[PDB]
Amino acid sequence: SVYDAAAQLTADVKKDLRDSWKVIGSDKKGNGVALMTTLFADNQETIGYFKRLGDVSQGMANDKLRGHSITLMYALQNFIDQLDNPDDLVCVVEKFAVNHITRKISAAEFGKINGPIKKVLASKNFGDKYANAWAKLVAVVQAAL
Amino acid sequence: SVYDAAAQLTADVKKDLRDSWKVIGSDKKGNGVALMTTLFADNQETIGYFKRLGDVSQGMANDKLRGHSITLMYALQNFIDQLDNPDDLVCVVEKFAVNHITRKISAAEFGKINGPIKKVLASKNFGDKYANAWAKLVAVVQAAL
Numbered sequence: 001s002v003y004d005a006a007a008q009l010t011a012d013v014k015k016d017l018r019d020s021w022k023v024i025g026s027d028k029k030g031n032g033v034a035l036m037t038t039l040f041a042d043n044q045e046t047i048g049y050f051k052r053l054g055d056v057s058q059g060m061a062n063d064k065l066r067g068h069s070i071t072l073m074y075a076l077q078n079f080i081d082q083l084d085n086p087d088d089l090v091c092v093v094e095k096f097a098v099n100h101i102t103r104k105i106s107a108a109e110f111g112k113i114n115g116p117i118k119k120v121l122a123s124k125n126f127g128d129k130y131a132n133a134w135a136k137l138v139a140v141v142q143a144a145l
Numbered sequence: 146s147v148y149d150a151a152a153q154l155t156a157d158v159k160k161d162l163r164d165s166w167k168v169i170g171s172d173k174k175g176n177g178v179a180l181m182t183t184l185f186a187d188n189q190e191t192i193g194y195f196k197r198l199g200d201v202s203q204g205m206a207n208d209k210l211r212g213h214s215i216t217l218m219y220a221l222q223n224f225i226d227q228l229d230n231p232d233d234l235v236c237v238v239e240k241f242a243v244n245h246i247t248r249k250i251s252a253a254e255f256g257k258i259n260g261p262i263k264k265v266l267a268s269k270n271f272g273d274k275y276a277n278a279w280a281k282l283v284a285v286v287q288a289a290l
């Protein structure tokens with residue numbers, strides 16, 4: 001269950017999630033857009049899912065993409081703040097899961113976000129240990145998909 | 146015009162928004178649910194729109210409502226953080242506006258949130274002064290509906 005995946009997050013993992021988010025989460029617009037653009041560059045097959053955002057090749061200049069990217073970072077902000085209370089993390093995760101379930105996004109496709117996250121983390125010098133930590137949080141969402 | 150509405154957020158308005166948010170935003174789950182139940186309590190005709198959340202009269206015991214309430218508080222957190230930049234405030238406002246436009250929520254019905262906001266603010270000892278400041282921010286979203 002989602003609760004099982006959440007309840008597994010250990011103190012060391014939560015520590016790595018928090019320390020890396022302190023940095024990346026401090027520039028939500030910059031790092032959020034970078035995440036989305038990286039996803040489109042490495043997984044061109046997903047572009048079709050974001051037709052509402054218009055021309056995503058426009059990057060920062062695209063207001064719809066910018067608004068979406070900033071908002072996405074707050075979803076992660078939400079997750080990070082709920083880490084110490086699995087019950088709350090679970091209810092917020094299931095809420096966002098519905099958003100993607102309605103767009104027919106499978107657990108497998110959602111995991112495509114791990115590659116981009118790893119690259120963004122790297123640009124700030126956060127290594128594999130940190131990428132692995134974020135992979136675990138993403139798995140919580142996957143458990144709901 | 147969402148842009149003209151955003152221009153209404155003068156230095157004094159932004160200050161009152163930040164000051165009051167420091168207190169209310171500190172307990173997103175509590176004040177978030179308080180906001181929603183007050184809305185359902187004072188405006189029973191809006192309850193129909195929240196069909197997916199199930200039985201809202203259960204309040205805090207309703208996971209879906211709790212997950213929704215917390216997320217809503219993060220939307221407000223988003224707005225507050227974008228106050229310095231009207232271009233970014235506008236693109237995030239329009240993003241959330243789309244979420245409600247699709248739900249057939251008009252500018253007038255969205256305005257019904259002003260009542261609950263004034264009440265939640267009052268219970269924390271923040272008067273009309275702060276309630277009006279928040280009506281200004283809500284007005285920005287209304288301009289995009």
Ligand code: HEM
Nearest residue numbers: 046049050052071072075076099103105109110112113244
């Ligand atoms: C860390 C990972 C991710 C987070 C936290 C996240 C967060 C979000 C948020 C907050 C929204 C807005 C939901 C709404 O208001 O309707 C959204 C929309 C969406 N997401 Fe994700 N997402 C992530 C990964 C992905 C991935 C990997 C895909 C695709 C394989 C995906 C596909 C979509 C689609 C299609 C939309 C709708 C866009 C639109 O039409 O506005 N998401 N996401």
Ligand code: HEM
Nearest residue numbers: 099191194195197216217220221244248250254255257258
């Ligand atoms: C302070 C003002 C408000 C804010 C910041 C706000 C924020 C939000 C957020 C973040 C969502 C989730 C978006 C999604 O995942 O699709 C949402 C959904 C929704 N909102 Fe609002 N909202 C506000 C006021 C209202 C009011 C006054 C109404 C009704 C008259 C309304 C009706 C809805 C409905 C029907 C949904 C869909 C709930 C669901 O099925 O999950 N909102 N709102």
